Amino acid sequence: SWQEKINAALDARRAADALRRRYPVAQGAGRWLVADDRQYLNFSSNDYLGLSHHPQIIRAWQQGAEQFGIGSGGSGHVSGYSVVHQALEEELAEWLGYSRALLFISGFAANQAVIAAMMAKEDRIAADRLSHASLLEAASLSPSQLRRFAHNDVTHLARLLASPCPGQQMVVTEGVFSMDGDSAPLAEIQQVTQQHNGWLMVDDAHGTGVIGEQGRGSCWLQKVKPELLVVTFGKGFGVSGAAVLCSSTVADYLLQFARHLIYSTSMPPAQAQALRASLAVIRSDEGDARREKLAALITRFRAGVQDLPFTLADSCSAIQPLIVGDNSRALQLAEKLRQQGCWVTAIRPPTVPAGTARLRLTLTAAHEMQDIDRLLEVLHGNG
Amino acid sequence: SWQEKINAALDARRAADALRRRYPVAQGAGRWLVADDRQYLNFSSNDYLGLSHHPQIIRAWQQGAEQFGIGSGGSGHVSGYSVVHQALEEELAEWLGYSRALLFISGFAANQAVIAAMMAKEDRIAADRLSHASLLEAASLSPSQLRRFAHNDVTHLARLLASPCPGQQMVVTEGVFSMDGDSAPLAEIQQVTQQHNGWLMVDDAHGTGVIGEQGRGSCWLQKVKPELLVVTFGKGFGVSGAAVLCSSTVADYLLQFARHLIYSTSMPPAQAQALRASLAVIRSDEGDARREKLAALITRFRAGVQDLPFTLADSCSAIQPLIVGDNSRALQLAEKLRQQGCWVTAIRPPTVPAGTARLRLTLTAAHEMQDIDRLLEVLHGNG
Numbered sequence: 001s002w003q004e005k006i007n008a009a010l011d012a013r014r015a016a017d018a019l020r021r022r023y024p025v026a027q028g029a030g031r032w033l034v035a036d037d038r039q040y041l042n043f044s045s046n047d048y049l050g051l052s053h054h055p056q057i058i059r060a061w062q063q064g065a066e067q068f069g070i071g072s073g074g075s076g077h078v079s080g081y082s083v084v085h086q087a088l089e090e091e092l093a094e095w096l097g098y099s100r101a102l103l104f105i106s107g108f109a110a111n112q113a114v115i116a117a118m119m120a121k122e123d124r125i126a127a128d129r130l131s132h133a134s135l136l137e138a139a140s141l142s143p144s145q146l147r148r149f150a151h152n153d154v155t156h157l158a159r160l161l162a163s164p165c166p167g168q169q170m171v172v173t174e175g176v177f178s179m180d181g182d183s184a185p186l187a188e189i190q191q192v193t194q195q196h197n198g199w200l201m202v203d204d205a206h207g208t209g210v211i212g213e214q215g216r217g218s219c220w221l222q223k224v225k226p227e228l229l230v231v232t233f234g235k236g237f238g239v240s241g242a243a244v245l246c247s248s249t250v251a252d253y254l255l256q257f258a259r260h261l262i263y264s265t266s267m268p269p270a271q272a273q274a275l276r277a278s279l280a281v282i283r284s285d286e287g288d289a290r291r292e293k294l295a296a297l298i299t300r301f302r303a304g305v306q307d308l309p310f311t312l313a314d315s316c317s318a319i320q321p322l323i324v325g326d327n328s329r330a331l332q333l334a335e336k337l338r339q340q341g342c343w344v345t346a347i348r349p350p351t352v353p354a355g356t357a358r359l360r361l362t363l364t365a366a367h368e369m370q371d372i373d374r375l376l377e378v379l380h381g382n383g
Numbered sequence: 384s385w386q387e388k389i390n391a392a393l394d395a396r397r398a399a400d401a402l403r404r405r406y407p408v409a410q411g412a413g414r415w416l417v418a419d420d421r422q423y424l425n426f427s428s429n430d431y432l433g434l435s436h437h438p439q440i441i442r443a444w445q446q447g448a449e450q451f452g453i454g455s456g457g458s459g460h461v462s463g464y465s466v467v468h469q470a471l472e473e474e475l476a477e478w479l480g481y482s483r484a485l486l487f488i489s490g491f492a493a494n495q496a497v498i499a500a501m502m503a504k505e506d507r508i509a510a511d512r513l514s515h516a517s518l519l520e521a522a523s524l525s526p527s528q529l530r531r532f533a534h535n536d537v538t539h540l541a542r543l544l545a546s547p548c549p550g551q552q553m554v555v556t557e558g559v560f561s562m563d564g565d566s567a568p569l570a571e572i573q574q575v576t577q578q579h580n581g582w583l584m585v586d587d588a589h590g591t592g593v594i595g596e597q598g599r600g601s602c603w604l605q606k607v608k609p610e611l612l613v614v615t616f617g618k619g620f621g622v623s624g625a626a627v628l629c630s631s632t633v634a635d636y637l638l639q640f641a642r643h644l645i646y647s648t649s650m651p652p653a654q655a656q657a658l659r660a661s662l663a664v665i666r667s668d669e670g671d672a673r674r675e676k677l678a679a680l681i682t683r684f685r686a687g688v689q690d691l692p693f694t695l696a697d698s699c700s701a702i703q704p705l706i707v708g709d710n711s712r713a714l715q716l717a718e719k720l721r722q723q724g725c726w727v728t729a730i731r732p733p734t735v736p737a738g739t740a741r742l743r744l745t746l747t748a749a750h751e752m753q754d755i756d757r758l759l760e761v762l763h764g765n766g
């Protein structure tokens with residue numbers, strides 16, 4: 001029966017396997033975390049530039065609501081396409097150097113709409129083995145053929161692409177990777193993809209806003225323009241939502257065929273004003289200050305761990321995995337950090353290679369040097 | 384090549400076939416529509432209760448931002464599960480009489496996460512031929528078997544279910560249908576689904592908030608509790624987002640397996656406060672007033688069309704399709720309404736049966752009797 005299927009998918013879970021509970025917080029974004037009325041240094045949010053509490057972004061969200069009300073009313077293809085949506089689209093495209101941008105309610109929605117509209121059964125998707133669940137989930141549902149290349153292995157990607165294919169090949173990878181905060185080799189990737197007449201799709205959720213001149217992100221930093229750029233706004237922009245950046249003809253194609261775009265409610269115009277305000281801060285001198293500060297905090301932390309019995313991943317992004325190895329080790333560590341007021345989150349098997357239990361630490365430009373030193377002090381004292 | 388595939392999917396579109404452009408508006412939700420600086424009576428938004436501009440909802444969105452900032456910071460399974468998300472979940476579940484509710488960023492996302500997590504290749508989805516693109520799109524991507532039953536045909540549904548199936552059967556339908564605003568026969572549908580040991584999933588996007596005691600929607604009005612209820616908030620709630628309503632064990636199942644829930648950014652807490660404020664208005668005496676007014680406006684309009692050479696669909700929801708038949712007819716009509724300050728949207732083949740060119744009119748409780756009379760006056764004068 002259905003219940004037997006549900007009770008048994010549940011009942012058959014291992015403990016230190018993959019069971020997951022949600023803890024409610026009063027504040028979850030930026031420097032601090034408030035949980036059951038206790039304040040903690042937050043090293044687990046994705047607010048990399050501390051923009052979630054920026055007063056200009058807050059102000060734009062508030063005044064937007066006064067100007068436009070809240071809900072848009074419907075679809076972009078009906079009466080839900082607001083002048084604010086269109087200004088934001090235009091501002092994104094100009095920023096990142098594309099012809100067009102189309103707004104989406106979330107990155108999952110944007111990654112899904114693209115793949116769904118663009119890939120057919122004859123087609124092939126070549127995706128990095130470590131690509132985000134949203135990319136892979138969609139690629140795996142797609143009727144097209146999914147092939148996963150070894151993380152960042154451009155030789156493998158090359159082989160995958162050179163195999164006879166009855167249609168077209170889309171290559172998918174991330175600008176900054178979710179797990180480890182490492183970058184893809186975009187210049188080389190693009191190079192083999194053009195060699196095989198494929199097109200490239202980059203999800204720069206973790207780089208957007210946070211690196212590059214004016215924060216333009218991984219592609220712009222690396223001098224690569226893929227055919228599809230997906231940026232999402234719930235990380236360094238400090239809000240929520242996403243855009244696909246692309247050419248005139250593909251944006252026209254997506255407007256005709258992308259059902260998720262055709263039939264979904266557009267975002268509240270006030271959310272779109274808050275996104276324009278965030279983009280403005282990101283492109284400004286204040287933008288450069290925040291990115292410089294986050295970089296100095298990363299330097300301070302990486303320097304401080306040299307002395308510690310932990311291993312760091314190859315990241316110079318806000319994402320800093322701290323390899324502990326033994327899961328009882330990690331668990332005990334994480335609970336110790338928490339007891340000392342540093343809120344961190346422990347990642348253990350099966351999520352990652354047995355003996356890779358890591359803390360997935362995040363830093364933001366809202367943090368201060370003395371926070372990093374506290375984290376370091378705490379990592380020293382117990383371990 | 385890719386470009387040939389894009390240029391040719393485009394180039395090979397028929398005109399009065401399915402080409403679509405987006406018109407930017409200054410205001411798209413509720414009584415009025417502002418476009419290129421002209422005001423129009425808006426008969427094309429999904430703001431059925433006029434709540435998009437309600438001052439208590441606006442106020443909650445604004446003060447939310449002051450209390451919690453904007454972005455949540457990340458996932459519900461990390462530091463993005465706010466006390467406000469949890470109060471909203473609890474308030475929804477209590478309202479609609481379920482054990483649990485899980486929040487989603489949009490209805491598409493919610494319909495996708497459920498189907499994806501719940502349906503396997505052995506399983507079957509039996510969906511109403513007219514189910515919304517989001518339900519069908521997901522059901523069609525699913526590895527499970529999709530079978531479409533004739534609109535509201537419980538005899539056909541019965542046959543579909545009685546066919547040998549190697550797994551489980553999920554029945555999917557809408558509380559109020561998107562296209563025509565008609566209701567499904569939920570009591571009978573549930574009845575055959577239980578007969579065949581299936582479970583039922585209802586998407587009540589178009590009924591939620593707007594009918595039922597305290598606005599509880601189609602299921603509650605019809606005394607049916609399906610196993611999955613999806614409600615979305617961009618229509619009568621006047622905001623954006625969605626929830627799945629379900630049992631303890633299935634919510635636990637969805638928290639473990641629903642990747643779209645596990646790895647997506649949660650909605651801004653301020654958006655969630657605005658949703659709680661909207662639910663409060665909906666459950667209140669003001670709630671009943673708005674629903675009574677929308678009902679009186681529907682009565683006035685349906686009564687006024689009896690005299691006119693158009694045909695109405697079987698709706699007593701805010702959705703009122705006005706059948707015109709001849710597409711040149713519909714087009715000319717719609718452009719005439721617009722020239723007379725009533726913003727309506729014309730739906731023609733191939734979207735609907737040749738000779739079914741209709742205006743898809745919507746009314747809301749923000750409208751007044753004199754708006755309906757203007758629309759009627761305009762429908763009379765030219766036709």
Ligand SMILES: *C(F)(F)C/N=C/c1c(COP(=O)(O)O)cnc(C)c1O
Pocket residue numbers: 046106107108109132134174177178203205206232233234235240241242456457458646647648
């Ligand atoms: C973030 F880390 F909290 C969730 N990861 C989300 C993500 C997306 C999804 O977009 P969302 O807007 O959150 O629904 C797309 N790409 C990547 C790399 C990530 O991490």
Ligand SMILES: *C(F)(F)C/N=C/c1c(COP(=O)(O)O)cnc(C)c1O
Pocket residue numbers: 073074075263264265429489490491492515517557560561586588589615616617618623624625
């Ligand atoms: C509405 F009419 F503008 C769009 N129709 C959306 C819809 C959904 C999708 O949820 P969304 O929140 O807009 O992404 C799900 N079910 C139905 C019946 C409709 O109409």
